[PDB]
Design a protein around this nucleic acid. Sequence first.
DNA 1: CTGGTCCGGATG
DNA 2: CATCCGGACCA
Lengths: 188, 189
Amino acid sequence: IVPSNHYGPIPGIPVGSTWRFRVQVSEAGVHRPHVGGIHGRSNDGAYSLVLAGGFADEVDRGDEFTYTGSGSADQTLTNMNRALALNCDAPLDDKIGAESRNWRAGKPVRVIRSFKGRKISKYAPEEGNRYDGIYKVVKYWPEISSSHGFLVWRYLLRRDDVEPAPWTSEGIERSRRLCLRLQYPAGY
Amino acid sequence: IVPSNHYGPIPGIPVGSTWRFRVQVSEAGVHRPHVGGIHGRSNDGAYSLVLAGGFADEVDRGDEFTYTGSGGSADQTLTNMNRALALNCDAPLDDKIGAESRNWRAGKPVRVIRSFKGRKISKYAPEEGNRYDGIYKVVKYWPEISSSHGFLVWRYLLRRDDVEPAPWTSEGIERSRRLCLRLQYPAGY
DNA sequence: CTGGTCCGGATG
DNA sequence: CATCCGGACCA
């Protein structure tokens, strides 16, 4: 195993790894919570997050994407929201957010793109949940959701991984080379 | 407003009340699901159900009727909503062969809505819309091969036990009239 | 930022 | 009759 609060890639799980259900992603250690989009500790940082299209105003360019906190009424920079913000190379600011000094100095975040992400993203997988590698918080800030109309906390993530992204020619060749296929639970 | 897990009649909604669409029945609190035939919770009981003639082998005598579980197609199982309705029966739960109530009137109450779509199998269904017919209780339930569909279904016997008279009786008809109960459409429709 | 389930209603 | 367009509810 690895500890629940492990930063960085999970040993033995290559980028391009794909599981049918969230619980499988949880078993593999890649994203512990079965439901929540963010795994983190509010005084340490965030270890991983899931892109599943929950917010219609989010955008995804593959190398970069915006992401939304949780917590309808206004969100606050608390709990998991605070945790992800702490990954950014910048002082914590729960009033106007912050932009990183040197973005690559941020703590790494495992990113999982779900098929449900096709609602807003062209880079999301056709099926299941795909591990897409390590990203870092460039900046975070509060804003009124265009789609929902209450204050949300938004984050800009930028990929910084030695493993090639699954949609690139190189990443596609590697998935094939490692025979990465959609994993169903035993019997299912 | 009553909680979603309320047993018994909805306050202010008399037997004989009729709504054109299922969503209206849902908004009145009488039957929460917009689509499903059974509202319940599988470790509690069932609160309401809708007769809309989806199973051709069901029978209806007004005071009593048989009802069919869902989940079925493959065989049905005594799970989810099926299990919920079974829990209403005054008897130990038995997911192999079912059970019959010791004292049927001690069972948990079930709100029954008869849909006009029920006229496929029943002469007690209304000509139009969805009608609240009052409180029924599960007398017994058992698994059986559907005569009309060929797979195993869970079947239930429901029996009326309500102080409010049934809509099709002389008394119920008088009462619907006296209360000016009419088919209700959504506003504007 | 689950997953399974579902006795509608409209359309044609 | 087949297909779509969905959500609400619960485990």
